[PDB]
C-alpha cells in the first residue's frame, strides 16, 4: 500500500519492541502488531522485519547489558552477568518462538539462521566477545580457578552456570567455548602444574 501505512506499522512495532525491552513483555498485546509485521515482510522488502529485529536487539543489548556489565565489573561481575543472560534468554523464549516459526520459510527460501541463533550470535558478538568484557572475564575466571586450586573453597555452581552459558552460546557445538575457555586456562594450568612438579621433585621423593 502507501508508504504512510507501512511507516505507521513500523513506528508502532518499534514502540512495542521498546516497551518490551523496558521489562514489559508478558503484559503486551502482540497478535495484531505481529500480523502487521508479517504484512511488512510481505510488502516489497522481504527482510524488513528481520533487519528491524536485528537492529532493535543489538541496540537494546548495547544500551542495557553492555553498560550493566561494564558498570559492575568488580561487584558480583559473573552473578550480574548470569542474571542479565537469563533475562535475555526469556526475552529469546517469547520473541524466539514467534520469529522462529517465521524462520521456517526463512530456512526454506532465505536459508538464513533462526532468530534464536541470531540472538545468540548477536549476544556473543556484543557481550562475551567485547573488546573489554572478554579479557576481564578471562582474567577473573583464571584468578578464581587458581584461588580454588590453591586450597581454599569458592563458589562452584556459578562456574557451571557460566560454562553452560558459553556452551549454549556456541550454538553449533564446542567451537567458541572450547577455544575461549580452554586456551588461556590450558596455559595457566600447564604453568601452574609445571611449577608444582618442579617444587615436588625437590621437596619430596618417589615414596
Amino acid at each position: 500500500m502507501d508508504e504512510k501505512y507501512v511507516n505507521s506499522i513500523w513506528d508502532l512495532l518499534k514502540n512495542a519492541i521498546q516497551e518490551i525491552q523496558r521489562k514489559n513483555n508478558s503484559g503486551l498485546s502482540f497478535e495484531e502488531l505481529y500480523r502487521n509485521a508479517y504484512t511488512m515482510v510481505l510488502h516489497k522488502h522481504g527482510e524488513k522485519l528481520y533487519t528491524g529485529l536485528r537492529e532493535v536487539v543489538t541496540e537494546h543489548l548495547i544500551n542495557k547489558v553492555r553498560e550493566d556489565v561494564l558498570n559492575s565489573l568488580n561487584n558480583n561481575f559473573l552473578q550480574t552477568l548470569n542474571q542479565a543472560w537469563n533475562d535475555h534468554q526469556t526475552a529469546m523464549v517469547m520473541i524466539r518462538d514467534i520469529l522462529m516459526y517465521m524462520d521456517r520459510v526463512y530456512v526454506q527460501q532465505n536459508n538464513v539462521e533462526n532468530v534464536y541463533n541470531l540472538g545468540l550470535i548477536i549476544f556473543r558478538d556484543q557481550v562475551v566477545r567485547y573488546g573489554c568484557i572478554r579479557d576481564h572475564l578471562r582474567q577473573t575466571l583464571l584468578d578464581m580457578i587458581a584461588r580454588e586450586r590453591k586450597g581454599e573453597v569458592v563458589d562452584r555452581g556459578a562456574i557451571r552456570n557460566a560454562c553452560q552459558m558459553l556452551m549454549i552460546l556456541g550454538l553449533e557445538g564446542r567451537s567458541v567455548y572450547e577455544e575461549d575457555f580452554e586456551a588461556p586456562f590450558l596455559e595457566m594450568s600447564a604453568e601452574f602444574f609445571q611449577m608444582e612438579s618442579q617444587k615436588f621433585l625437590a621437596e619430596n621423593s618417589a615414596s
Binding site: 513483555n25 508478558s26 503486551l28 498485546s29 502482540f30 517469547m94 518462538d97 514467534i98 522462529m100 526454506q108
Partner: protein
C-alpha cells in the same frame, strides 16, 4: 526403534472420542463467534504456531480464551479434526483456504498434503490462479510446476481473466523465460500489449521493463504508435525514451518456434540388449533420429494419441511382474514436450492391452484393449476428461472386436475391425451401423485425413487399400502400393504436411529391413516416392512398434548415439 501400532490407533480413536465429547478443554479458540473447545497439545501435534501462543509466557499463554482472527471456521475445524482423528477430506474447492490457514498456522504436514493435491490438480482453467497463489505464498516447488504448466497452457489460451491481475515480477519472469510454446513471437507481443492496456497509467512504469524482455523485432514496428495513442497526455519522458531505447538486449529467436512435424515411435527395438524396448523418433525435415525417454516402467503394449493441442498421452499397457512374466496395469501418463519425461496422471478403471487412444472434443477415448473383465460387455469403452482429470464411461460398442483400430472424423469416433464398422455419436452417446468392407483384413492401422478414412494394409500385412468416405458411406478401392515382391512390408498410415503418407518398412529374403516412405496422391490414386530413409541414420525398430503424428523440439531432445 519401531512403534506399536495397536495402542497407537487406540490412542487416536480415544482422542477422537474426547474431541467429540467435550471434556478436557482448558483452551478454546474464539473465531468469529464460533467456540472451538480443544487442547493446547493436540494443537501442538498439528501446528507449529501455537508454540508461540502457548509455550512462550505471553498474555495469550495464560489467557484460557484466545480470539483467533483472520481465519475461517470451516478451515479451522477441518485442521482441528485433522489433528484429532486423522481424516483430511480434501475437496476441489476449499483447498485454497486450506493452504491459506496452513501457512497461517505453519502446519507442515497438511501443507505438504495440500501442496501435493495442488500439484496433482494443476490444469488449464486454474493455471494462472494457482501461479498467483504460489506467488502469494512461497511454495517454490509448486511455483515452478505452475510456472511451467502456466507457460504452456497460457501460451495456448492467453485469454484467461486472472492474467490481468498479476504482479509485475511474475509477468517479467513469465515473458522473459525461454520455455514459452508459441507458433509465432507476435502473440506474446499482443498479450503483453493487452495486459499493459488493461489498466491506467499504473502500467506505464512497468512498460519500460516488459519491453526490455521482448525481442526487438517488434519494438520498432507496429504496436509502438498504439501505446502513443494510449500514452498519458503531455508525457515527454516515455515517447522519446522508447525512441532511443531499443538498441540493446540481443535479439534471439525463442524456443516455441522449434516444433516440427515428426514421427514418434514407441516400443522400438532396443539398441543395447540389456533393455527390452525403447522409444525413438524420425525427423522428416532434419533427416535424423532423435531419442526419447523410455516408457514409464518400460510400459509395453500401450497406445498413443495426440490431441489437436499437440499433447501426447499413454494409456493401458503391462509391466513385467516381479521366462515369461507380465502383469497388466491401468496406469495413465502424460508426456512433457520440454522436460523429456512422462508425468503420471489419473489411472483408468480397467487395465488394457494395446488400447486405441482417440481424442475428440477434448476427451481421450480408449476403445477396447483386452480388458480384464470379459463379462457380457467385453468392450469397456471409456473416455477421459482433460479439465476435471477423471474418467467417465460411455456407450458400449455393440459388438466385441479384437485387434481393432479407431480414428476420429467429423467430431465422431470411427472404430474399425476385420469387416465391421460402428460410428459413435458423442452428443447422444449411441452407435450407428456403417458400411461393410468386402475384404477380411486385420492387424492394420488407419489415418484420418480430412473427411475420409484410409484403412491401409491388413491380414504379414499386404498392400490392400480401402478408402471410406464419411459423406458417401461406402468402401471403395483405389490402388495397391508398388512394393518389392516376396517381401513383408510393415505399413503405417499417417498424415503429414497436409497429405496422406505411409511409413512402410519392407524386408527381403536374406536381407535386412529397408525404410522408405511414400506420398499417396489423393486425386491421382498413386503412391509417389516422397523421401527415402537412409539406413545410415535409422536402424531396425521391430514389429510391434507404433507411429503417430506430433511436434517435438529438437533442442530439448538429444540425438541418439548409435552406429549406422
Amino acid at each position: 526403534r519401531q512403534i506399536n501400532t495397536e495402542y497407537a490407533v487406540s490412542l487416536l480413536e480415544q482422542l477422537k472420542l474426547f474431541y467429540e465429547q467435550q471434556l478436557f478443554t482448558d483452551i478454546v479458540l474464539i473465531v468469529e463467534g464460533t467456540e472451538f473447545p480443544c487442547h493446547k497439545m493436540v494443537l501442538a501435534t498439528c501446528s507449529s504456531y501455537f508454540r508461540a501462543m502457548f509455550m512462550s509466557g505471553l498474555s495469550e499463554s495464560k489467557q484460557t480464551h484466545v480470539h483467533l482472527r483472520n481465519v475461517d471456521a470451516a478451515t479451522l475445524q477441518i485442521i482441528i479434526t485433522y489433528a484429532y482423528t486423522g481424516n483430511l477430506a480434501m475437496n476441489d474447492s476449499t483447498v485454497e483456504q486450506l493452504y491459506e490457514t496452513a501457512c497461517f498456522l505453519q502446519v507442515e504436514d497438511v501443507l505438504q498434503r495440500c501442496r501435493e493435491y495442488l500439484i496433482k490438480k494443476i490444469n488449464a482453467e486454474n493455471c494462472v490462479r494457482l501461479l498467483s497463489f504460489a506467488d502469494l505464498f512461497s511454495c517454490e516447488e509448486l511455483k515452478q510446476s505452475a510456472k511451467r504448466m502456466v507457460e504452456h497452457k497460457f501460451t495456448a489460451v492467453y485469454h484467461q481473466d486472472a492474467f490481468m491481475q498479476l504482479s509485475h515480477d511474475l509477468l517479467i519472469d513469465i515473458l522473459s523465460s525461454d520455455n514459452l510454446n508459441v507458433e509465432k513471437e507476435e502473440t506474446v507481443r499482443e498479450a503483453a500489449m493487452l495486459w499493459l492496456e488493461y489498466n491506467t497509467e499504473s502500467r506505464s512504469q512497468y512498460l519500460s521493463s516488459v519491453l526490455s524482455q521482448i525481442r526487438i523485432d517488434a519494438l520498432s514496428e507496429v504496436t509502438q504508435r498504439a501505446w502513443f495513442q494510449g500514452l498519458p497526455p503531455n508525457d515527454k519522458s516515455v515517447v522519446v525514451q522508447g525512441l532511443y531505447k531499443d538498441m540493446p538486449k540481443f535479439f534471439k529467436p525463442r524456443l516455441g518456434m522449434t516444433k516440427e512435424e515428426m514421427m514418434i515411435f514407441i516400443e522400438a527395438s532396443s539398441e543395447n540388449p540389456c533393455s527390452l524396448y525403447s522409444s525413438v523418433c524420425y525427423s522428416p525435415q532434419a533427416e535424423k533420429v532423435y531419442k526419447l525417454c523410455s516408457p514409464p516402467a518400460d510400459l509395453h503394449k500401450v497406445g498413443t494419441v495426440v490431441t489437436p493441442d499437440n499433447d501426447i498421452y499413454i494409456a493401458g499397457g503391462q509391466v513385467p511382474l516381479k521366462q515369461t512374466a507380465f502383469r497388466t496395469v491401468n496406469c495413465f501418463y502424460w508426456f512433457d514436450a520440454q522436460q523429456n519425461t512422462w508425468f503420471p496422471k489419473t489411472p483408468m478403471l480397467f487395465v488394457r492391452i494395446k488400447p486405441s487412444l482417440v481424442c475428440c472434443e477434448g476427451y481421450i477415448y480408449a476403445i477396447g484393449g483386452d480388458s480384464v473383465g470379459g463379462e457380457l460387455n467385453r468392450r469397456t469403452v471409456e473416455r477421459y476428461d482433460t479439465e476435471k482429470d477423471e474418467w467417465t464411461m460411455v456407450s458400449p460398442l455393440p459388438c466385441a472386436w479384437q485387434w481393432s483400430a479407431a480414428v476420429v472424423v467429423h467430431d465422431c469416433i470411427y472404430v474399425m475391425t476385420l469387416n465391421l464398422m460402428y460410428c459413435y455419436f458423442p452428443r447422444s452417446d449411441s452407435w450407428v451401423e456403417m458400411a461393410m468392407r468386402q475384404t477380411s483384413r486385420s492387424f492394420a492401422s488407419a489415418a484420418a485425413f480430412g473427411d475420409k478414412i484410409f484403412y491401409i494394409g491388413g491380414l504379414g500385412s499386404s498392400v490392400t487399400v480401402e478408402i471410406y468416405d464419411v459423406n458417401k458411406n461406402e468402401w471403395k478401392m483405389a490402388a495397391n502400393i508398388p512394393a518389392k515382391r516376396y517381401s513383408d512390408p510393415c505399413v503405417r498410415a499417417v498424415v503429414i504436411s497436409n497429405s496422406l503418407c505411409v511409413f512402410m518398412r519392407e524386408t527381403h529374403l536374406n536381407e535386412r529391413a529397408k525404410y522408405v516412405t511414400y506420398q499417396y496422391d489423393l486425386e491421382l490414386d498413386r503412391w509417389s516416392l516422397r523421401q527415402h530413409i537412409s539406413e545410415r541414420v535409422l536402424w531396425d525398430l521391430g514389429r510391434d512398434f507404433r507411429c503417430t503424428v506430433g511436434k517435438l523440439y529438437p533442442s530439448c531432445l538429444e540425438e541418439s548415439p548409435w552406429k549406422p
